[PDB]
A and B are shown apart, each in its own frame.
Chain A
Amino acid sequence: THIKPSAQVVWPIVGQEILNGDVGGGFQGIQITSGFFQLWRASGITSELELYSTALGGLLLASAMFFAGWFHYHKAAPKLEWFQNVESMMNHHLAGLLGLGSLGWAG
C-alpha cells in the first residue's frame, strides 16, 4: 500500500544516478508503470527464487524456439499441403492453445 514499484537501477556514472528515486524498502531506482509486481502477487510468487527460475526457464525455452526456427526452415520444412490444413489448425489452436492453456492456468 506504500512502496512504489521499481526494477530498473541506474549506474552512477555521468551524474545520472539522480534518476534513482527514493521509493521504498530502502531502495533507489526507477518507478515501474508496467505492472509486473501486481501480476506477480496474483500468481502467488513471493521469493526472488521463483523469478530467477522464470528468467532462466524463460530464457531457456527461448533458445528452444530459435532451434525450432532453424529446424523448420533449413532442416525439416513442411510442404504446402501441411499449411493448407485449416480445420486441423483450427481444431488445435482453439482447443490446444486456448482450451488447454486455460485449464492449465485454472490449475
Chain B
Amino acid sequence: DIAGLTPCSESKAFKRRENKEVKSLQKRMAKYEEGSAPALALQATAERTQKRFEFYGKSGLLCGNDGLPHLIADPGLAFRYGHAGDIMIPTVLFIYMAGYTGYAGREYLLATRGEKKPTQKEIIIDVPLALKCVAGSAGWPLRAFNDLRSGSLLEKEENITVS
C-alpha cells in the first residue's frame, strides 16, 4: 500500500517476528517445572507479548519488508490514509506536555521576580507559589496568545547587546 508498505496484520515477516519470539521463550521455560515461579514468570511474558502483536496487527501499523512497524510524518498522509496516531496526534500531546512545563516556568520567574532578592527565591522554591503557577499554567495556549497580542510576552528592546 502506502510507500510500498503493507499493514502489519497482513504482513508476513511480522508474523514470523511474533511467532519466533515465543518459540525461543517457551523452549526456555521447559527447563522450569510449574512449581517454580520462573515457569510462571516466563509464561506470563509469552502471553503478555502476544497481546501486543494482536494489538499492533489490529491498530493498522505499516510494516515494511523487515516486518517492523514504521510511521509516517506528513499530516496529509497520516490523516487521509487513516493512521495519524503515530506522530500527528501525539505531536499535539507533547506540545501541551512540554509547553505546560515551559509556560509554568515563565510565570514562576515573574511571580518571584519583584522582591528584595529574587536569587534566594530561585534556589529555595516556595512550593505554594510554584503550585499556584502549576495550576495557572493550564490552558497556556490561550494564555500565550494573550501575552502575545497584549504585548506582555516579549521584553521588547531594553535587552542588552554587545557592539
Contacts and interface: CB of A to CB of B under 8 A. Distances in A.
B50 interface: no
A22 B28 contact: yes
Contact of B33 (A12, A20, A26): A26
B41 A28 contact: yes
Contact of A27 (B33, B38, B44, B45): B38
A1 B32 CA distance: 20
A27 B37 CA distance: 8
B31 interface: yes
Contacts of B41: 12, 17, 20, 28
Q: Is the interface of B mostly helix, strand, loop or mixed?
A: helix
Nearest to B25: A18
A28 B45 CA distance: 14
Contacts of B28: 22
Interface in A14-52: 17, 20, 22, 26-28
B36 interface: yes
A22 B31 contact: yes
B152 to A, nearest CB: 43
Nearest to A29: B38
Contacts of A27: 38
Interface of B: 28, 31-33, 36, 38, 41, 44-45
Interface of A: 12, 17, 20, 22, 26-28
Given A26-B32, A26-B33, A26-B38, 12 more contacts: A12-B41, A12-B44, A12-B45, A17-B45, A20-B38, A20-B41, A22-B31, A22-B32, A26-B36, A27-B38, A28-B38, A28-B41
